Amino acid sequence: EFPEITEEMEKEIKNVFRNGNQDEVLSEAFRLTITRKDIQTLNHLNWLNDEIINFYMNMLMERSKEKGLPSVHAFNTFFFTKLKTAGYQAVKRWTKKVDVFSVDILLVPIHLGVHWCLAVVDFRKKNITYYDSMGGINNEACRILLQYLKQESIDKKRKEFDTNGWQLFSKKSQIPQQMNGSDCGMFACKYADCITKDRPINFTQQHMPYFRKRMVWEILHRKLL
C-alpha cells in the first residue's frame, strides 16, 4: 500500500534536517507554527514535541471531512492533562463552537510525564479505548474522559449522557509494540492514522523511520499519503 519516497522529497527533507536557522518559520495554518526546531524532532530518534502532534492531529481531522470516512474532532495535546489535573471547569470551554457529539471519533493525544499515548472516543462503536505502544495500561484515562462526556453533555446539550452499553479499555500485546526508546509520539500519530481511516492497524517499527521522513513532507505541504 506504500507511497514511494521520491527524490524530490528526500532532497527537501534532508535540507530541513541540516543544522540551520532553528527558529525559521517553515509552515503555517491550523494557527500552528512549525519551525526547523520542531521539524528536527522527527530526525533519527528524537522525542516528538507537542507542536508536531497537534499538527498531525489536525490533518488527521481535516481528512476526516472527506466522503466515506468517519468524521473526527481532535483535541490538542494539553487538553487531557489539563482535565486530569484541573478538572472540567477548566476546559469547559475549549469546545465552545463544536458539538463533540455530532462527530464519529474523538482523538485524545495524551502527555504522561515523559511519554506519549492516545485515547479514542468512538461514538459509533460505543467504546473509549486507550493506546500505549510500550503496552502500559491507563484505565483511569478512560474513566476520566467518560466523566468529561457526562459533564460536557450537561453543559452543551443540557441533558445527561446515555452511558448505557459503553466499553472502556486499553490495548495490550494485541497491537504493535514500541520496540525502541523514542518512537512513542510516532506510534501515537500513526496509531490514529489507521483508526481515522477505519483501516486496521498493520505497521511495525521499520515502518517508523519511513513514517518519520514521510511525516515531514506530510507536514510542510499538509497532505497525508
Binding site: 527558529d23 491550523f30 494557527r31 500552528l32 507554527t33 526546531k37 524532532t41 522525542w47 516528538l48 514535541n49 507537542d50 507542536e51 497537534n54 483535541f75 490538542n76 495535546t77 494539553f78 487538553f79 489539563k82 489535573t85 477548566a90 476546559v91 469547559k92 470551554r93 475549549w94 469546545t95 465552545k96 502527555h111 504522561l112 515523559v114 511519554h115 506519549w116 526508546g181 523514542s182 518512537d183 512513542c184 509520539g185
Partner: protein, 79 residues
C-alpha cells in the same frame, strides 16, 4: 476602543493579571509574562480556550473579553 483585563494562568496554578487595549498584538504581553515572573518563551505555549495564540494575534482578533483567561503550558516532549 477601551482597555481590558486578562488573566494568564500557569499550570502551576498561578494567575497573573494584565491590562491592555483590545487592539494590541500579544507580543507585548507574552514577553512581559516571561520577563516578569521569569520564564523562557521558546519553551512555552499560550492558548485561549485551546485556540493557539500567536504573537501576531490581538484580543479583538481572538474575540477576547474583560477578565478572560489565557492558559500557558510547558512545551512537552515524549519518547
Amino acid at each position: 476602543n477601551d482597555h481590558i483585563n486578562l488573566k494568564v494562568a500557569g499550570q502551576d496554578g498561578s494567575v497573573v493579571q494584565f491590562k491592555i487595549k483590545r487592539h494590541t498584538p500579544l507580543s507585548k504581553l507574552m514577553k512581559a509574562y516571561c520577563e516578569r515572573q521569569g520564564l523562557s518563551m521558546r519553551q512555552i505555549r499560550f492558548r485561549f480556550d485551546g485556540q493557539p495564540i500567536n504573537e501576531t494575534d490581538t484580543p479583538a482578533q481572538l474575540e477576547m473579553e474583560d477578565e478572560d483567561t489565557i492558559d500557558v503550558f510547558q512545551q512537552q516532549t515524549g519518547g
